[PDB]
Design a protein around this ligand. Structure first.
Ligand SMILES: [Zn+2]
Ligand SMILES: [Zn+2]
Length: 82
């Protein structure tokens, strides 16, 4: 997929770096930090529908992230015939 998984970490970092865009993230800005990593309120997207979730509630799965809805219809119950 992507040939470039070399460490070569940096001396130090005083800011939460992003994973989607790979751009340093700040506080004032709306983002989603989970277990360290942090995705900009706009970067944080779904894995199924692929829709910017952002601050909005979500459901992180094994090597993926399902937004509330997706998880609401995927796992959680719901009226199929509305
Ligand atoms: Zn980002
Ligand atoms: Zn979704």
């Amino acid at each position: 997929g992507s040939s470039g998984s070399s460490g070569k970490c940096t001396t130090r970092e005083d800011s939460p770096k992003c994973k989607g865009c790979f751009k340093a993230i700040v506080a004032g800005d709306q983002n989603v930090e989970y277990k360290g990593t942090v995705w900009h309120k706009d970067c944080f997207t779904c894995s199924n529908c692929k829709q910017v979730i952002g601050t909005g509630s979500f459901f992180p799965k094994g090597e993926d992230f399902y937004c509330v809805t997706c998880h609401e219809t995927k796992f959680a119950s719901g009226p199929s015939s509305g």
